[PDB]
Amino acid sequence: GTPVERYGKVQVCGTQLCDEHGNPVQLRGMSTHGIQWFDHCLTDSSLDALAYDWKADIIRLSMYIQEDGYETNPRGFTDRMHQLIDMATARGLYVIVDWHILTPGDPHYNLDRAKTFFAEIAQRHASKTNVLYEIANEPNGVSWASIKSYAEEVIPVIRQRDPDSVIIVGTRGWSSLGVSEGSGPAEIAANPVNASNIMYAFHFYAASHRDNYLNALREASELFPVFVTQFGTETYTGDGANDFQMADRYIDLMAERKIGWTKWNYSDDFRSGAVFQPGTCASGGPWSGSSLKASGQWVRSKLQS
């Protein structure tokens, strides 16, 4: 069966994401790049490849708000997101709907838009069991208390329409569980979001983020559910040399704790983190072999087990 057929209606149980019968499950997959730039990478052909060939469990649909994203055409972006959610569902994939804030880094900057967007998405897709909602990608320059209060404003909008869906909440310092801004996950544990069926996001780039970030991820997974919605094997820019030795340490920890992940990213951007070589999406593939960057061959190999 497909991932969705095998695990069904996933929910948080204790400090882990579980399938519909209480067994902890690790969902591993890929994140798209921003759809305002790399929409041409997301076709019947590339998505079929991700599902049937790469054996991904999950796809994260990254919708930037600024940077020529959602704010420029709310109707058009929303319609394309409905289409992509349906396409992922038709290939048996779990889907993360990613409200991809970055700059400005205060999520409240985009709150009014977020409520509109998520109200539409949650009403339309309420009957689906395979959609997770990520309400704020990479909060930065803000306190944990302000992220918590943002989450408590948006969560009821979703839950009013779709009460059983899992929501992922971004964390301080570009979702580094506070590490980049001189803090850590203990801050979250002491003042958690007042809702359940919640997970907290962690992002890392293995060439830049070493033992202190790895230790923070281990600490956080003792206290609350974590999903790695964005990670790379290169530096924090999404480019540069890969450190696969460090990446493998993260992969092993995540497998051991059943922490799900989506790798940045499923596009043919020039940066080393984008899994395809430039020109691949314009050529219509192939989505394996000589079209893969080093990071691409590495992740595809992890996903195929």
Site residues (vs Zn ion, CB under 5 A): 44, 48, 126, 162, 164
DSSP codes of every residue in 110-146: GHHHHHHHHHHHHHHTTT-SSEEEES-S---SS-HHH
Beta strands at 16-18 and 11-13: parallel, antiparallel or unpaired: antiparallel
Instruction: Tell me the closest approach of the beta carbon of residue 93 to Zn ion, in angstroms.
Output: 13
Q: Which is nearer to Zn ion, 32 or 295 (CB)?
A: 32
Instruction: Tell me the closest approach of the beta carbon of residue 41 to Zn ion, in angstroms.
Output: 15
| Furthest C-alpha separation in the chain | 51
Instruction: Tell me the closest approach of the beta carbon of residue 49 to Zn ion, in angstroms.
Output: 9
| Cα 14 versus chain centre, distance | 21
CA-to-CA distance for 177 and 179, rounded, in angstroms?
6
Q: Which is nearer to Zn ion, 30 or 220 (CB)?
A: 30
Instruction: Tell me the closest approach of the beta carbon of residue 92 to Zn ion, in angstroms.
Output: 12
Q: Are 229 and 262 in contact (CB under 8 A)?
A: yes
Q: Which is nearer to Zn ion, 138 or 162 (CB)?
A: 162
Q: Is 250 exposed, middle or buried (0-12, 13-18, 19+ CB in 10 A)?
A: buried
167: three-class secondary structure by DSSP: strand
- Angle, helix 74-90 to helix 111-124, in steps of 10 degrees: 40
Q: Which is nearer to Zn ion, 111 or 126 (CB)?
A: 126
Q: Which is nearer to Zn ion, 44 or 68 (CB)?
A: 44
Strand partners, 198: 167
Instruction: Tell me the closest approach of the beta carbon of residue 127 to Zn ion, in angstroms.
Output: 6
